[PDB]
UniProtKB/Swiss-Prot annotation:
The chain holds residues 226 to 1601 of 2151 of the full protein. For endonuclease activity. Binds 2 Mn(2+) ions in the active site. Displays nuclease activity with Mn(2+) and also some with Co(2+), but not with Mg(2+), Ca(2+), Ni(2+), and Zn(2+). For polymerase activity. Its cofactor is Mn(2+); Mg(2+). GO terms for biological process: cap snatching; DNA-templated transcription; negative stranded viral RNA replication; RNA-templated viral transcription. This is RNA-directed RNA polymerase L. It comes from Hantaan virus (strain 76-118) (Korean hemorrhagic fever virus). Residues 672-855 form the RdRp catalytic domain. The gene is L. It catalyses: RNA(n) + a ribonucleoside 5'-triphosphate = RNA(n+1) + diphosphate. Classified as His(+) endonuclease since it has a histidine upstream of the active site that coordinates the first cation. RNA-dependent RNA polymerase, which is responsible for the replication and transcription of the viral RNA genome using antigenomic RNA as an intermediate. During transcription, synthesizes subgenomic RNAs and assures their capping by a cap-snatching mechanism, which involves the endonuclease activity cleaving the host capped pre-mRNAs. These short capped RNAs are then used as primers for viral transcription. Cleaves ssRNA substrates but not DNA. Seems to downregulate the expression of its own and heterologous mRNAs through its endonuclease activity. Its EC number is 2.7.7.48, 3.1.-.-.
Amino acid sequence: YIPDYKGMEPIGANIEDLVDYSKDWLSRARNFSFFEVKGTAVFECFNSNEANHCQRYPMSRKPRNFLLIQCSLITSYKPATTLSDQIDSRRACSYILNLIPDTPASYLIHDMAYRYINLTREDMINYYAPRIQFKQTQNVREPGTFKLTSSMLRAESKAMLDLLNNQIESLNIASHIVQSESVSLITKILSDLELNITTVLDKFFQNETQKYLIDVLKKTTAWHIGHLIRDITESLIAHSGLKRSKYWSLHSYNNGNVILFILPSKSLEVAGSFIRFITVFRIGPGLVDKDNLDTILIDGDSQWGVSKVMSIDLNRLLALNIAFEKALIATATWFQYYTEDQGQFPLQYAIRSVFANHFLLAICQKMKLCAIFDNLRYLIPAVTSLYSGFPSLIEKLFERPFKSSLEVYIYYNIKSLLVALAQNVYPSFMSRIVYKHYRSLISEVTTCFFLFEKGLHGNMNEEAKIHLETVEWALKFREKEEKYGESLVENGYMMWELRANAELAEQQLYCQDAIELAAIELNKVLATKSSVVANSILSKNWEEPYFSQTRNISLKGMSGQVQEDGHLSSSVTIIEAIRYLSNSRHNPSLLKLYEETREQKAMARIVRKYDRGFFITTLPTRCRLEIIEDYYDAIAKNISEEYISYKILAIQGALEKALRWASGESFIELSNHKFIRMKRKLMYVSADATKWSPGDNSAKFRRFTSMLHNGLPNNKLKNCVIDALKQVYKTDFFMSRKLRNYIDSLDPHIKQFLDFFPDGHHGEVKGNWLQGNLNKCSSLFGVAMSLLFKQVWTNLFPELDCFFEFAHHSDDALFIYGYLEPVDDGTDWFLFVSQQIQAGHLHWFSVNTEMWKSMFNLHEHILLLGSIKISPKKTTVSPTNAEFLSTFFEGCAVSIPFVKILLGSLSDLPGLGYFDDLAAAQSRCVKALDLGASPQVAQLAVALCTSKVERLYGTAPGMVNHPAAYLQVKHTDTPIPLGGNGAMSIMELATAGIGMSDKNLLKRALLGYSHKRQKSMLYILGLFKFLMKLSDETFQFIGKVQWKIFTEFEFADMYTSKFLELWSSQHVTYDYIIPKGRDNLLIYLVRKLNDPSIVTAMTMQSPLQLRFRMQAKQHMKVCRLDGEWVTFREVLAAANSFAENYSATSQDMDLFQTLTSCTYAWKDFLNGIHCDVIPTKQVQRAKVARTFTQNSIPAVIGYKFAVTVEEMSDVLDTAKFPDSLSVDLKTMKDGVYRESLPDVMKRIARVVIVQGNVEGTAEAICRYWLKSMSLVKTIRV
């Protein structure tokens, strides 16, 4: 049912009025929005911005520090163990004691070393024993700590502690001396870091990756420095616990050459806590910043550098712990990109220098460098294009002050690189190589950008920036509304109003005539496809229940109810769905929910920490946005073949028309019949016209929806969409408590931001839909207005044969303007222009020279007739350029660079247990391999991730939790949940999946017991049976050891757990499909809250409650066994005992046989495929996305266990064809019988970026992956 919803009345809009206005507009001189690049222009822009920056910020003489941990290495480094730690600590304390301190930091250092050296044997035994053997003593209260009362502490040392317990300036960038000093320092550091210290996939890896990358980087100083920093950060993390952060600690590494002194600090579990330490090292080559060192104590024929008290937060610590892996993966990505670019391996010096630069970037995680690289990502294309917004970007480069010497060196390198690029083979950024294609340079800068953790973003400065941006645009909207009236701003102005004012053409101010004409131009195309438009609109299923869909019960994040304190509650979508279902009496449809929540105001907030991009909104706002998005996505999919890319063929189709039109030549007629030969040229603009802008007006869409012609017979749905757009007009923006407290704890901008809120917890914002999902609506509007500009231009110059073709993919948009230039370069064209301008065609003044400039000016103005503004910065216009088109097509093709997923895998883990996070790490590297990563790079990433996971859980050989110590089976043949080699290969993981090791093992084990009846095969079967027993004990693959999960929600305990288990057992069908009714959907959603895999996702960013909460237990009692919390060693021993006495049974054999039978012959293909190399140079092709692959599978399974009328009706409703369901079962069971009982059925139960040659078959994808195994040499399968 659709209610009457007023609707809108059509107005009389004539294209001739717009054409006349365009004539009047073009009759005068207009300025261009972009500046020509010349090299000199970029250099003067840099100089002027340098002078302005020097004037703006106060000048400082002493640069700040940038090395969080300073250390030096002369010899090779071996990982630190307990006995090595003992010997190192003793030697280091002796070395410190023989010295003479100078400053309070040195006095504290000497005092702590002297206190450590005088500990008794009992304390030393307890200082290094694990928790099991640990005993509290007088001087040692926690495993790796000791106390320090005031008595041993000196007066000065205490001074440091009291100073610890108890304006903005920048460097002189314009000065040549500061730049020279910073460049010299960073060059010294980098040169020290580069100094040397003194299956078939395996074959290809050892031939290429292990030889030219890992063998080269194995001997460098940066490799061992990264390992040393990993050890130091591991020791710091071990000290960040709740019970250990209160006391001091001392550690040593590298034969007594590096020492770490940990001071008392607030535990990192509570947010905003900094672990404080002092690092003391013998001064030598490496991460040494002598100026920023606290002291340099003198020793005979030696120097000992003592750093200042370094405070490192949580995310910085976690980033430093994985800095070496991030640097290695970035270097591997650069290695792959170099091989792609040039076809030859990088030499020694190039690889060493790029690895040193990546390591230095990964060590120093600073906001300034992250912003600098983010800006450079767009600065590079803007400098290679004929015209662009480069000054706006160069001005953005100086937003923040330059504090450390690292920022000055990076800025100097960027300035040199940009000036070299604009003068124009493209120079590199951290080496002496010139790339053949600048896409390699863009990828290099992108890899550098992704080396910075996505936790740096946010802070309290970024949230303030986005808040002030929103408030500034809201205040601008209020000013415009009071200046022109409420009605004119909301409903838009008319053509004659704009003609009279000649100013209303601005942002947050649209023209009704423009909207109507754009809708008419869209309807021109839309009329021929009315039937399919109506079918697609009706196919959105507006009648199905709202909360039974997956998008409405996800973890997206929505605003809750307003509280008594007046602040909006951030919460989860599923929680709000549960709340509504509990308060409601049914499960309403989309339109019914909109009817119920039409009167409620739209409230909005900002996500706490997950943050500028997510304006979380309440349920009614989401419902209205979903109505509008469903309608506009339904009507917009039909013209996706030509204008709205979702796709590549549309962009290819537009370019083909442009090139063909340019190939043909044109003649213009004359009154004297003297045809004039015109040369056709093309100009390409890469504009981000359709991004969401804070300054905008949603109300325009109303009129658009009023005139957009669908095939529906009634106007009920159109009026409903218009009413939803009307209700999403006004919103109640809410202050975040963090920002409120930060501001409460004087600036005029802050003052005016405060007056924007009457009550200090909320203020009204109008016309800004606050980043809500209206992407399809915005893209459709942009396409319609581009078509309107095309029509206006064709009406403006009928005699001229100009060309305009546009494509809109996501936020980016490509405009191609085909213009006419004189061939003879004579005055005949200007003579004709003069004749036309004298004949009354005054608008021909702007066509005299540079027709494409006037074309773009008119296009930008026509877009401005709405709220669309082509961003001055970030738009780049170039002639017909193969590289430009190639990078545009690549950015349209490679949606996400694989290096983002690669670095992300080491940065975050689920922490649900060894198997779970190992699977997640292996899955992320597989997804990156899908995204375009070379198999060798993905194999390297897999190795690094698996090694990190093994280090975390002590599974690697020669560690406490090694399965081979007790399980009497080889580490390779051990099941994955108990520690299992868990390495395999990237090909096996990508093709088969992320669990094949267990089945292959089980399968062979079954065979090993079926034919030879060997004892070890029976042992493996016993281990598998033990895992199945543990899984049976655990409540909702073969079997998983349960690991402790640390917690918490409003409705998470609405029903008892035993009732949930009983309901899940009784209503089996709801496990496979979602229950439509409210009384059962409520219980299903409550069950979804208690799922362990979801709680870890809601709190995955919790400050330590997840990040180090379980990186602390590691070797404690965290596993579940026999209803007890026990150590992993105890679980391994229990598994060994169970498997030793396990006796084979017929039922277990049947279960194992069924599981093996259930688990495409992907492994068999990889064994049977043959690959032989050919001596032929590799060729790089365009990147293209492919897919790797009657009733739905769950519906038939859901139908199988249907026992009541409600369940059977629900499985009808969710199924596409509810009639065929029985037939499916009727055959499916027979198939099972040829391969029934409930339990057997219960246990029975990808976009890939490739080259253009690859087909859409999964075998073709696997063959391509096999071909891409060699970075230089081609392969034949």
